[PDB]
Amino acid sequence: MASLEDGTYRLRAVTTHNPDPGVGGEYATVEGARQPVKAEPSTPPFSEQQIWQVTRNSDGQYTIKYQGLNAPFEYGFSYDQLEPNAPVIAGDPKEYILQLVPSTADVYIIRAPIQRVGVDVEVGVQGNTLVYKFFPVDGSGGDRPAWRFTRE
Numbered sequence: 490m491a492s493l494e495d496g497t498y499r500l501r502a503v504t505t506h507n508p509d510p511g512v513g514g515e516y517a518t519v520e521g522a523r524q525p526v527k528a529e530p531s532t533p534p535f536s537e538q539q540i541w542q543v544t545r546n547s548d549g550q551y552t553i554k555y556q557g558l559n560a561p562f563e564y565g566f567s568y569d570q571l572e573p574n575a576p577v578i579a580g581d582p583k584e585y586i587l588q589l590v591p592s593t594a595d596v597y598i599i600r601a602p603i604q605r606v607g608v609d610v611e612v613g614v615q616g617n618t619l620v621y622k623f624f625p626v627d628g629s630g631g632d633r634p635a636w637r638f639t640r641e
Contacts, residue, residue, distance in 0.1 A: 493587055493597065493638060495544045497557065501637040502528045502614050508596045508635060517541065517577075517619060517636070519555045522564055525576035528614040540641045541565070552582040553599070566612070568621065571603055577612055577619035585612075587638075596637045612636070 501514040515528035516539040529535045542554045542565075554565035567580030586600040599612040601621055613622035613634035622634060 492545065492549075492589075493543060493551070496542070497540050497641040498543050498638045499531070499539050499641055500541060500553070501639070502619075503596055503635050503637050504632050505590050505598070505635050506632045508590055508593045508637070514637075515614065515617065517553075517566075519564070519579050521579065523578055523580055525578055526566065526619045528617045528619060543638065546584065548584065549586075550584040550602075551587055552584060554582050555579055566599070566619075568601065571601060571610060571621055573623045574615060574620050577621065590635050593637075595639065596635050598633055598635045 500517040518527045518529040519538045542557050564579045565582030567583045587597040590596040601610040603610050609624045
């Protein structure tokens with residue numbers, strides 16, 4: 490094997506420069522159909538909304554879906570229009586590229602494929618809302634948002 494195995498995971502918001510902040514993480518959190526996915530603490534009113542089924546397609550890309558499966562419709566990380574600072578919404582699951590962060594066994598940049606040359610769209614957070622952050626592929630080694638995937 491290689492890459493992340495299929496399963497149910499919690500996703501904690503970190504960065505490439507600080508992949509392991511310590512206790513007190515903010516986790517991807519569903520908050521209703523077609524609503525923005527948020528970054529919230531692992532606390533009583535949210536825990537059930539913080540587990541995600543991650544699956545790799547024959548493509549090598551992954552969907553991140555809310556709560557296993559079996560409802561009328563599968564909801565997961567998605568986007569209406571992919572634009573800078575647009576929110577990640579719980580919608581028809583989109584496909585993503587997961588890039589393992591150097592020095593870590595389990596932190597990945599969640600990348601949303603787009604046309605644009607020399608541009609990388611990555612899932613980040615702005616005020617506790619997950620959003621698409623656009624970065625130049627500049628070779629700078631600059632800070633990028635990333636996510637620690639821990640098995641549930």
